[PDB]
């Protein structure tokens, strides 16, 4: 039979509290596992989302000076890298959230801000998220334009730390490709195509988002460039990935779903897609396959 789903986006109210690992619960290697201030700082985070209900305002926070230095730190050096790597859509809205959204080195953006600019520009919105759901509460959102998001910050000893995503990659990696309607449409695609899928189809519609959205390659007149909000918001990972020592394949949902998603390393392969046209095209091909 047909698991539940949601039908209508205030709906996901009963599926983003689904959280099977809470923002708080830190792995044993995370910078912050030993400090108590930060683990209540995390705590409190988590409770702002899990009390957030659809309809309601994101909860502005007061981010702390540590905070915000580790943000600029981030912001700085991915900025210096950004021309010369990110593609055309990227660096086509990343002005847009400086004017609008209060991007700057030593301001951290709020997430109900970005919500609305988003929201006008390509009907996205934001919803704060606890901590890590299942793919196919996730992938959920995407149908209804929702892009659930921490809101944390990474622990301030380490501000290079990226196995788990904070609201420095949230804001940096995704929120400048979601402002953009190619892209946009693309994500929601993945989100309808999971909805009351199969587990096995979930688990390939993931893969393919994962070396897309958060790990994606395009090519753009001619050159290699980056889409995936995880490379977006990873310093070292980002300089990797287009230089020659990163193995690259055209991206093919059938072959692209096979591939393990890496956690703690840099990923051993990654897919170029020829536009987020194309790579939307792709997926429309392969789900066909997969649901029904
Ligand atoms: C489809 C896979 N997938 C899932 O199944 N469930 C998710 O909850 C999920 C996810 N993917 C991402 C977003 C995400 C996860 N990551 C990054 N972005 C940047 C690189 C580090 C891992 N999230 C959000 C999330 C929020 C807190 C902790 C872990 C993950
Ligand atoms: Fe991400």
Same mark, same amino acid.
């Given at each position: 039979?047909?698991?539940?789903?949601?039908?209508?986006?205030?709906?996901?109210?009963?599926?983003?509290?689904?959280?099977?690992?809470?923002?708080?619960?830190?792995?044993?290697?995370?910078?912050?596992?030993?400090?108590?201030?930060?683990?209540?700082?995390?705590?409190?985070?988590?409770?702002?989302?899990?009390?957030?209900?659809?309809?309601?305002?994101?909860?502005?926070?007061?981010?702390?000076?540590?905070?915000?230095?580790?943000?600029?730190?981030?912001?700085?050096?991915?900025?210096?890298?950004?021309?010369?790597?990110?593609?055309?859509?990227?660096?086509?809205?990343?002005?847009?959230?400086?004017?609008?959204?209060?991007?700057?080195?030593?301001?951290?953006?709020?997430?109900?801000? !970005?919500?609305?600019? +988003?929201?006008?520009?390509? #009907?996205?919105?934001?919803?704060?998220? *606890? %901590?890590? $759901? =299942?793919?196919?509460?996730?992938?959920?959102?995407?149908?209804?334009?929702?892009?659930?998001?921490?809101?944390?910050?990474?622990?301030?000893?380490?501000?290079?730390?990226?196995?788990?995503?904070?609201?420095?990659?949230?804001?940096?990696?995704?929120?400048?490709?979601?402002?953009?309607?190619?892209?946009?449409?693309?994500?929601?695609?993945?989100?309808?195509?999971?909805?009351?899928?199969?587990?096995?189809?979930?688990?390939?519609?993931?893969?393919?988002?994962?070396?897309? !959205?958060?790990?994606? +390659?395009?090519?753009?007149? #001619?050159?290699?460039?980056?889409?995936? *909000? %995880?490379? $977006? =918001?990873?310093?070292?990972?980002?300089?990797?990935?287009?230089?020659?020592?990163?193995?690259?394949?055209?991206?093919?949902?059938?072959?692209?779903?096979?591939?393990?998603?890496?956690?703690?390393?840099?990923?051993?392969?990654?897919?170029?897609?020829?536009?987020?046209?194309?790579?939307?095209?792709?997926?429309?091909?392969?789900?066909?396959?997969?649901?029904?």
């Amino acid at each position: 039979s047909v698991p539940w789903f949601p039908k209508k986006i205030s709906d996901l109210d009963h599926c983003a509290n689904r959280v099977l690992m809470y923002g708080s619960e830190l792995d044993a290697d995370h910078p912050g596992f030993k400090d108590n201030v930060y683990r209540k700082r995390r705590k409190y985070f988590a409770d702002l989302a899990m009390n957030y209900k659809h309809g309601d305002p994101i909860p502005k926070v007061e981010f702390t000076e540590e905070e915000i230095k580790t943000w600029g730190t981030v912001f700085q050096e991915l900025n210096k890298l950004y021309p010369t790597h990110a593609c055309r859509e990227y660096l086509k809205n990343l002005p847009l959230l400086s004017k609008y959204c209060g991007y700057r080195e030593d301001n951290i953006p709020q997430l109900e801000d !970005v919500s609305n600019f +988003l929201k006008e520009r390509t #009907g996205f919105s934001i919803r704060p998220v *606890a %901590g890590y $759901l =299942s793919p196919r509460d996730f992938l959920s959102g995407l149908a209804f334009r929702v892009f659930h998001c921490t809101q944390y910050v990474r622990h301030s000893s380490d501000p290079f730390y990226t196995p788990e995503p904070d609201t420095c990659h949230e804001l940096l990696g995704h929120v400048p490709l979601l402002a953009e309607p190619s892209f946009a449409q693309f994500s929601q695609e993945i989100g309808l195509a999971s909805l009351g899928a199969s587990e096995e189809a979930v688990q390939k519609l993931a893969t393919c988002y994962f070396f897309t !959205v958060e790990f994606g +390659l395009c090519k753009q007149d #001619g050159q290699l460039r980056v889409f995936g *909000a %995880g490379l $977006l =918001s990873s310093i070292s990972e980002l300089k990797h990935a287009l230089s020659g020592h990163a193995k690259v394949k055209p991206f093919d949902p059938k072959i692209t779903c096979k591939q393990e998603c890496l956690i703690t390393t840099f990923q051993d392969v990654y897919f170029v897609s020829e536009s987020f046209e194309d790579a939307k095209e792709k997926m429309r091909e392969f789900t066909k396959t997969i649901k029904r």
